[PDB]
Symmetry: C3
């Protein structure tokens, strides 16, 4: 399971590069790179990543934007690729491999609003996803969501699993060793974290008493479904996959398939710390608990 | 996995205490207690329970009721707590531990209609849920459900798993040993049972030919999702989490996350016995089959 | 796990027999038979089947049709039966066993539109399903689907698992050895395949650039849920269980319970080959990837 050319390799994170190039066109450049991430205290995973993050950096575009995407493969020996669930594309032409030390550019439209998974598409896809090559792209709906004016504060959360290192038998046949949440920044000052068992417990997300919170969520897997629940509240409104039409109300828990997304909104009525879980409690026990700290001011 | 102070302990079930104290206020008193339950024939589980039942006793309130909840902890050594998924509360103030031989009182509103899980909230939550500290609270919608006038008969069903006794490794990493249904009484004469592999086979729920049946259902887990199905019928109407807005029709099978609820309604057209399953058939084989006996009169 | 009377038995497939006998009445005759199926290259499973296919042959009826169903049991020693999820029936009278070398006839209505599982109902049901006795019945809605006029081409896909041969311990407690797709023909010229790891990769489904494709899908299990996703597109419209009322839009991935169905519709915008997966990637790795080849003409 050890790739000789990855020994000792720890490529420092590289910032996502994005720039708008027209009213409906956006350039995005990512890397594929090999980066050590502390997934549990004392446990380093030499992850296969986009940009040195796992899950990868957040991408946000508008409905109707065409994405001109470049992948720069920094892995010395493994090809990598990109599949955005947001886009309409030819997989065999547009989600193809970029060889080590090369770049590739691929263009495709994001026609549909929502909270989409992205991930590496190189065979075996399970191997590339499980080693860390997953993330979220949000496509903002042209006309918003009907409840936009009620939302006071918003964050992005992503659920993923971690297995035994680069172990295809475990990836296929074993239970996850860890299941984790991470948060990816939407506005300056938001946290930006990797999938680990501890950061969002020790540095909770912050909010203020009485606020309606929106979370953009996706369960990237690779393998498990998620029973997403915020303790001490009920979801006022849920939009499955973030499409405004798929509108549920008053859900205690949102069932997410592997790669499933949602926009969920809830009110926090009292000061305190509110756990955020997958209610599949074996997974929660193995790391998948984040915290939301609600104060009279909204500051820690 | 054996707690010395639980040896030989078998605390007889204690009735739930509920009383309305105002037009929108209700007192509820439960216990936390250690009680032997026969989960399969010849198999005793010394369960951690509310009130000596696992799942615990049914709670029914109205939308807009504030619950003034008291937990009396009869466990000689383990703290326990209560988390109602129905309520808006501060988890770190209102879902806190009650020490052995003590009581605690916590007040919070049930603002949202539906079929909610409740459970102990004491760390490790997986341990407390898996050992039996789960249940359902139903919050009745102020304006009912649109199909109320069509329903002839109704029952509550709950799905849960059982693992190796108090074994955190198994709870986290193992398949369930048993998966089971129980029924909790809504009206005098309804059965009231615990999560076991046999009672609802040997003493089926009863109905009459031609009736529309409503089931209030919740899959409390701890770990598995449920593929809820009634053999020989199709769900005419489904309300996800019991919120009247989340209205599906003509479903063969309802996907429930861990902690997921629903109101489901179906018509039984012919005399006979109708199995009720999770269609994840490994779980059905390990206990999760209940029976509905439909007769020309509705009596056995 | 070896049944002596099945040694060397390989009953050649028998065609489904269907004929309409009135404006709202249809005769269907199936067999139960024991047939060797190559589920992975070099791996034969001596399946328990309807008609020598696993999943079994496709059945299509109209909403409001009463089905007069005959099962001819060709198994020399095991009883078999039939449960259609489409129908309202008495399970203990209408889904009963047919003994070896006998036939039984059962009549029941299909009142509800959708994409329903069918399967053998003989105890242990897990054993009969896992050994291959599953399939789909489609009930066409009297008034169609609102998007009917947009659909250019349609196919049926079914997901199932395969375990160690006739091994009840594995069926209950083990991970699937294979997870697979098959396609069942709706119109002359459509492929008709069994649940295997390779046929729909080597002989992809065919379509033409720009088309809107409808898939009628069901995850028959026995045990797993499915995270159904088409690479390179987004589902424009989804009807859960194939009921026109259960209408979602813009889903990346559709969560299917065990026995869950859907009608899903999506547009393929560019020439190429488009994988079709369960996004639970351990299952995809173990076989559950089909291909859709999209050409400028629609022919290979
Ligand atoms: Cl919880
Ligand atoms: Cl069934
Ligand atoms: Cl994919
Ligand atoms: Cu414009
Ligand atoms: Cu450290
Ligand atoms: Cu990769
Ligand atoms: Cu994907
Ligand atoms: Cu698992
Ligand atoms: Cu506000
Ligand atoms: Cu809430
Ligand atoms: Cu009042
Ligand atoms: Cu006994
Ligand atoms: Cu407890
Ligand atoms: Cu909970
Ligand atoms: Cu399991
Ligand atoms: Cu009636
Ligand atoms: Cu029905
Ligand atoms: Cu007619
Ligand atoms: Cu061969
Ligand atoms: Cu059979
Ligand atoms: Cu079934
Ligand atoms: Cu599995
Ligand atoms: Cu067209
Ligand atoms: Cu699409």
């Amino acid at each position: 399971n050890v790739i000789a050319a990855h020994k000792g390799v720890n490529q420092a994170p590289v910032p996502l590069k994005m720039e708008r190039v027209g009213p409906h066109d956006v350039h995005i450049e990512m890397t594929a790179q090999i980066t050590d991430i502390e997934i549990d205290k004392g446990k380093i995973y030499k992850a296969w990543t986009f940009n040195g993050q796992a899950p990868g950096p957040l991408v946000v575009v508008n409905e109707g934007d065409t994405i001109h995407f470049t992948l720069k493969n920094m892995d010395p020996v493994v090809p990598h690729s990109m599949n955005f669930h947001a886009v309409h594309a030819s997989p065999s032409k547009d989600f193809i491999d970029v060889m080590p030390n090369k770049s590739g550019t691929f263009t495709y439209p994001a026609n549909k609003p929502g909270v989409f998974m992205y991930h590496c598409a190189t065979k075996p896809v399970l191997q590339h996803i499980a080693n860390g090559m997953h993330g979220v792209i949000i496509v903002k709906p042209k006309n918003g969501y009907p409840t936009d004016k009620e939302v006071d504060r918003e964050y992005v959360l992503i659920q993923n699993e971690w297995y035994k290192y680069n172990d295809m038998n475990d990836f296929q046949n074993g239970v996850p060793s860890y299941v984790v949440f991470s948060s990816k920044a939407l506005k300056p000052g938001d946290p930006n974290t990797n999938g680990d068992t501890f950061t969002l417990k020790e540095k909770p997300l912050l909010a203020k008493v009485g606020e309606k919170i929106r979370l953009y969520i996706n369960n990237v897997g690779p393998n498990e479904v998620s029973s997403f629940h915020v303790v001490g509240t009920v979801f006022d409104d849920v939009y499955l996959d973030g499409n405004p039409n798929n509108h549920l109300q008053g859900m205690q828990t949102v069932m997410l398939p592997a790669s499933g997304g949602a926009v969920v909104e809830f009110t926090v009525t009292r000061p305190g710390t509110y756990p955020i879980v997958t209610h599949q409690f074996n997974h929660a026990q193995k790391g998948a608990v984040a915290m939301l700290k609600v104060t009279e001011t909204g500051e820690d």
